[PDB]
Design a protein around this nucleic acid. Sequence first.
RNA 1: AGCUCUCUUUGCCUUUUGGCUUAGAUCAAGUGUAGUA
Length: 319
Amino acid sequence: AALLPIAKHRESLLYLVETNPVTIVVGQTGSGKSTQIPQFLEKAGWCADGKLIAVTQPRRVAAVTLAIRVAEEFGCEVGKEVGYSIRFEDATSESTRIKYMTDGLLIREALVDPLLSRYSVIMIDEAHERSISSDILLGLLKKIRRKRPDLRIIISSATLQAEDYRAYFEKASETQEEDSSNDKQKESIASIISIEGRTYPIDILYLDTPTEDYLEKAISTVFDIHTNEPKGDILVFLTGRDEIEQAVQAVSERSASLPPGSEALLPLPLYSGLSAEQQMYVFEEAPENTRKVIFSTNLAEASVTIEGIVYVIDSGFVK
RNA sequence: AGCUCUCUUUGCCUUUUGGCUUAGAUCAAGUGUAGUA
């Protein structure tokens, strides 16, 4: 946990969240923002007054997995110190301080608490995913922050459009223009803090011509990169369930015709409505003299992180 | 060198195709999905 770049800038983000009303953090998923920032604010002592910290997530399985991960890292049980709430599932308690909430459920709790007086800082992680409820939380937190400046707001930005986020925090309102008569300096209500990540160098390869049928060149790319390059788990991002079904059937039929004595290929699908067995098959690592070829839809992006993956083929289409 | 029973081979066909014409004429077919939880 100490090797994450979020630990090196912990004092800077603590200062910016204690001083500025809103601070926008820029960093990609995997640098430890969502895993350590609630831990950093808890260790700073933002829950000593019985006040809570909340993390507003767009995805549900991602919320559950990050809840159990941070509960394991913190050494605490789920729901008694670090808890979560997804739709019709509220693992929370009075002693719980760190909250991983569905943003839609914080709409439904904004039907309960008007000023959000039960929470100290509200943060929107991976805000460029841009759910509807995240944006309407942004609007209502802007209104409440005009109404109550005591609470704090953190926004996690993937890239430069945080500046546009920054734009959303200079145009506050129009009633303040009547009171804008003094020559005081415009205080930095919104600030930006840099926490980078760490990724290995990745080679990008394109095509000289536009592809004809991305399924057939996807599987032919899979078999060519299996034959040529050394061991590494091949992953492809396809679009929809019938496409992954056709891909796994095609790679199974071609692996039936592969010459013996080489590395075998294990076809694996990744969907949203998977059962426990094949999902665990994807999660468990490749056997001896076997290379996993995993065809995935939009789960391996941010929702569920799979490890030991070297190759990735982009179909260029998302539903 | 018989008579019974058993088995094999030979014989047997024993439920063993009951008219006609322009082969009498004509003959494609419901739907199969599933970014995200």
